[PDB]
From a paper:
Apoptosis‐inducing protein of 56 kDa (AIP56) is a major virulence factor of Photobacterium damselae subsp. piscicida (Phdp), a Gram-negative bacterium that infects warm water marine fish with high economic importance for aquaculture. AIP56 is a short-trip single-chain AB toxin18,19 secreted by the type II secretion system of Phdp20. It has zinc-metalloprotease activity towards NF-kB p65, and targets fish phagocytes leading to their elimination by post-apoptotic secondary necrosis. In this work, the determination of the three-dimensional structure of AIP56 shows that, instead of a two-domain organization suggested by previous studies, AIP56 has three-domains: a non-LEE encoded effector C (NleC)-like catalytic domain associated with a small middle domain that contains the linker-peptide, followed by the receptor-binding domain.
The final crystallographic model of AIP56 does not include residues 290-295 (ND1), 362-385 (ND2), 422-429 (ND3) and 454–455 (ND4), which are poorly defined in the electron density maps. The three-dimensional structure of AIP56 shows a three-domain organization: (i) a N-terminal NleC-like catalytic domain (N1-F255) with a conserved zinc-binding motif (H165ExxH); (ii) a middle domain (G256-E307), with a disulfide bond (C262 and C298) flanking the 35 amino acid long linker peptide (S263 to E297), packed against the catalytic domain; and (iii) a C-terminal domain (P308-N497) previously shown to be involved in receptor binding. The active-site zinc ion of AIP56 is coordinated by H165 and H169 from helix α6 and by D176 located at the loop between helices α6 and α7. In two of the AIP56 monomers of the asymmetric unit, Y207 from the loop between helices α7 and α8 is the fourth zinc ligand, similar to what is observed in NleC24. The middle domain of AIP56 is composed of one α-helix (α10), two 310 helices (η5 and η6) and two short antiparallel β-strands (β4-β5). Two cysteine residues, one in helix α10 and the other in strand β5, form a disulfide bond previously shown to be important for AIP56 toxicity. These two cysteines flank the partially structured linker peptide that comprises helix η5 and strand β4 plus a connecting 15 residue-long unstructured loop (P270-A285) that contains an aspartate-rich patch at its tip (D274HDDD278). Although this domain shows some flexibility with respect to the catalytic and middle domains, it establishes a series of contacts with helix α2 of the catalytic domain that prevent large structural movements. At the C-terminal end of the catalytic domain of AIP56, a helical hairpin formed by two amphipathic helices (α8: D209 to H231 and α9: E234 to K247) contains residues potentially available for protonation (E214, E218, H222, H231 and E234).
Residue numbers in the entry: 1 to 289, 296 to 361, 386 to 421, 430 to 453, 456 to 504
The structure:
């Protein structure tokens, strides 16, 4: 069974989960996607109204990525089925004059606070249209939405579901339905993710139930008011930022004029999603002893132009920790800074295996090897690599696509006899019997992680 149902058919939700499950996202892919989302949200700061909505957007998407199997099926579907990539989507908080109040207001900059304060959800002068749209100039996917509500307002988890909804429209291409008592495939998909993440949301007859529409007007009206409450001392600076973004313009990328978030503290601010004991990653606006920060680029700072995911972005500092590549980064950056790479005559890294100024070795198929030392390449910021806890001259192999393959270690005896670890799913795996090349890479030269980061040793590889 595989008829592609129409984008508006409820059975299209089943079509997305059934095809997205065919290609499960490995650990390397979840780590790539989480780092791509963090970057997309950061690059969206000029269009987000405040640090609160910016943090709510990022942690909502990362929480779903980590703890919602259906969200992973949805995101996987898009990659394999010519829809949008989760990291490609940018976010806007574009407000506009309510159509029923446009006889008095001709600019967003005219509406005062008391015009919103002394109003109701149906006649509020400012409205934001939740929409999965495209920037007509560049063709980039955008998600438009209103500001995030107060954490314990009782509305926040529905705002969360509402954001996942608009993303579902991009990564699955599904549509919504007008029909009575029908939720539609996008709303079905979003509600599954919300159910898995324990997000409490209200239920209605269908997507176009008038009761549903009135409740959304209420949620978005209260979120705008909760947001104003958040900025009681900088209302002038907040309204100017709102008006700038409202006219499709880029406002401060670092929220410069807004400072009142520090006084409010972490306590009432969105929390980073829960993660494994072996996870390196944290919040954006507050840093351990907690103390708020004004540097925003530093967490998504790319390490080197040569270390990137294929067809993706350059690996950020956390990417190396989460993928067990800190020893690999140190030894690669070492040869690439020292004596460079020297081309020896062996067909591949496998053929080589079978028969100060740190150097590197390039093979005939493009693959390469790097030097490993217990003294210089076993450190405190290299210690956490899982091959270290598991169980010294080594030569770590990288395939023709510059991806990590294996790490072969030896001690000063039995010159020979040593230890071997293999790279699979963002981790190193101890393979005791040293014949693993015939029993693992049987008739192949490539790494066991086809999603692992690329360590482009020589600049010309960027062309092939
Ligand atoms: Ni794209
Ligand atoms: Zn929709």
């Amino acid at each position: 069974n595989n008829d592609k149902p129409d984008a508006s058919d409820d059975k299209y939700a089943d079509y997305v989960v059934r095809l997205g499950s065919e290609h499960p996202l490995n650990h390397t892919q979840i780590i790539e996607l989480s780092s791509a989302v963090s970057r997309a949200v950061l690059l969206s700061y000029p269009n987000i109204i405040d640090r609160y909505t910016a943090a709510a957007t990022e942690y909502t998407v990362i929480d779903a990525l980590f703890h919602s199997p259906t969200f992973r099926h949805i995101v996987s579907f898009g990659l394999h089925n010519q829809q949008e990539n989760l990291g490609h989507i940018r976010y806007t908080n574009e407000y506009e004059i309510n159509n029923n109040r446009e006889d008095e207001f001709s600019l967003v900059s005219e509406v005062s606070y008391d015009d919103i304060k002394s109003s109701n959800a149906q006649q509020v002068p400012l409205v934001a249209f939740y929409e999965a749209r495209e920037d007509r100039a560049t063709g980039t996917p955008i998600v438009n939405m209103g500001v995030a509500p107060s954490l314990f307002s009782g509305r926040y988890s529905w705002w969360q579901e509402a954001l996942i909804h608009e993303i579902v429209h991009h990564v699955t291409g599904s549509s919504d339905t007008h029909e009575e008592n029908k939720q539609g495939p996008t709303e079905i998909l979003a509600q599954m993710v919300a159910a898995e993440l324990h997000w409490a949301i209200p239920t209605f007859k269908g997507y176009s139930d008038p009761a549903r529409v009135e409740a959304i007007q209420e949620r978005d009206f209260h979120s705008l008011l909760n947001m104003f409450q958040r900025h009681g001392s900088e209302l002038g600076f907040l309204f100017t930022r709102l008006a700038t973004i409202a006219k499709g313009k880029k406002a401060s990328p670092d929220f410069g004029t807004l400072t009142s978030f520090c006084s409010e503290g972490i306590s009432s601010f969105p929390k980073y999603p829960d993660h494994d004991d072996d996870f390196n990653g944290g919040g954006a606006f507050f840093l351990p002893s907690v103390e708020c920060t004004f540097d925003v680029l530093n967490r998504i700072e790319p390490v080197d132009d040569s270390i990137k995911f294929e067809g993706g972005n350059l690996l950020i500092k956390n990417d190396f920790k989460n993928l067990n590549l800190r020893v690999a980064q140190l030894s690669f950056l070492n040869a690439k800074k020292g004596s460079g790479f020297y081309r020896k005559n062996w067909d591949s890294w496998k053929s080589w295996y079978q028969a100060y100024s740190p150097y590197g070795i390039t093979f005939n198929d493009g693959s390469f090897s790097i030097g490993f030392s217990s003294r210089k390449h076993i450190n405190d910021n290299t210690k956490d690599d899982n091959f270290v806890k598991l169980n010294y001259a080594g030569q770590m192999f990288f395939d023709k696509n510059k991806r990590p393959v294996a790490l072969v270690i030896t001690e000063p005896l039995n010159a020979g006899a040593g230890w071997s670890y293999i790279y699979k799913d963002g981790k190193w795996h101890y393979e005791a019997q040293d014949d693993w090349d015939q029993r693992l890479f049987k008739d192949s030269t490539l790494s066991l992680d086809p999603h692992a980061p690329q360590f482009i040793n020589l600049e010309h590889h960027h062309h092939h």
